[PDB]
Design a protein around this ligand. Structure first.
Ligand SMILES: Nc1ncnc2c1ncn2[C@@H]1O[C@H](CSCC[C@H](N)C(=O)O)[C@@H](O)[C@H]1O
Length: 240
């Protein structure tokens, strides 16, 4: 099991090596930040910190951020990336399924970004993870959760490029239960990743079913060469 972890740690290293956060931050809107700002959000819990891009973006915007992740190794990279940008990250190692075990506060908002939720292959785990997020939200809190547009693939199979042509993402295999993407970087590096191909309405169903009163799903065009369909969706789920 130590190889899968090592394989993905190599992947995110390669991603951050070749894709600098300043370009990424210019490309990603200020939409997410504005959404939190216009809701008066102060406390944010990042449950998919990875190497810390979302967290650092929110610290720079002035939010109080708690940075969680299942991986201690990711969190070390996150903390030092934050350190480099001049911020003190507050890291907590936690699994989405018992988020409650190490986190003892409630939040104005939770972010789960970068197509993260897709890493769960069991519906039971999906429900639990969402219920954990929901309990961690204040009564008026909000969950921001994104995903790739898998509907586009399931129903026209080609590569998608990010940060110009720095990395290409190609669907090698996609069925209802699994999407395998080939990632190729500009320096020649190739990584192959499995994730669960969530349909837009299916995620929405899950969110509405664990208790979220209202859900707005935004189309998000992140790829270099844009198509009629968005390559991402952002779910904005209000607890009320
Ligand atoms: N069940 C789980 N509980 C807690 N963290 C999990 C998890 N499953 C996956 N993760 C974490 O979710 C992360 C996905 S990577 C996302 C990085 C960041 N959001 C960005 O956009 O750059 C990984 O770092 C991984 O360790």
């Amino acid at each position: 099991d130590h190889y899968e972890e090592e394989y993905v740690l190599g992947f995110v290293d390669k991603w951050d090596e070749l894709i600098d956060w300043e370009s990424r931050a210019e490309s990603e809107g200020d939409t997410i930040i504005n959404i939190l700002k216009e809701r008066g959000v102060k406390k944010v819990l990042d449950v998919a910190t990875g190497t810390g891009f979302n967290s650092v973006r929110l610290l720079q915007a002035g939010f109080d951020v708690v940075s969680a992740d299942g991986s201690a190794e990711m969190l070390v990279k996150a903390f030092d990336n934050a350190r480099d940008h001049g911020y003190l990250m507050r890291t907590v190692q936690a699994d989405w399924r018992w988020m409650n075990k190490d986190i003892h506060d409630k939040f104005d908002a939770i972010v789960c970004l970068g197509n993260s939720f897709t890493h769960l292959f069991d519906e039971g785990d999906r429900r639990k993870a969402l219920a954990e997020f929901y309990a961690l939200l204040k009564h008026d809190g909000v969950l921001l959760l994104d995903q790739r547009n898998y509907d586009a693939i399931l129903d026209s199979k080609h590569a998608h490029y990010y940060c110009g042509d720095t990395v290409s993402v190609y669907p090698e295999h996609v069925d209802e239960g699994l999407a395998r993407f080939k990632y190729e970087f500009s320096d020649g590096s190739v990584y192959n990743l499995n994730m669960f191909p969530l349909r837009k309405d299916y995620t929405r169903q899950l969110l509405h079913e664990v208790g979220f009163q209202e859900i707005n799903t935004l189309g998000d065009f992140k790829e270099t060469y844009k198509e009629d369909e968005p390559d991402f969706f952002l779910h904005v789920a209000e607890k009320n």
